[PDB]
Amino acid sequence: TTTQSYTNSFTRGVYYPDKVFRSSVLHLTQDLFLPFFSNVTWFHAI
């Protein structure tokens, strides 16, 4: 079976919003990101 414990996302799940190159910038993107320090479900494989 599997468990259903909870953990903290931290600074995780951030991806590249598009295929646009950007060097030494601070671009702000509105996109479907994983919220920081969010609850992430934990599962197991037995």
Partner: protein, 49 residues
């Protein structure tokens, strides 16, 4: 490898990757500027700079 476009701080196309040779190329304005005609009084002469 996944990057195709290229931009900068003010959201303008700066560089482009070649879709046929997988090489990079940057983009610059062609010759934009401003023409100012320097001239003495037209009652004096007609030559201009």
């Amino acid at each position: 490898p996944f990057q195709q476009f290229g931009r900068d701080i003010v959201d303008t196309t700066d560089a482009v990757r070649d879709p046929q040779t997988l090489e990079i190329l940057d983009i610059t304005p062609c010759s934009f500027g401003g023409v100012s005609v320097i001239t003495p009084g037209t009652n004096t002469s007609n030559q201009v700079a």
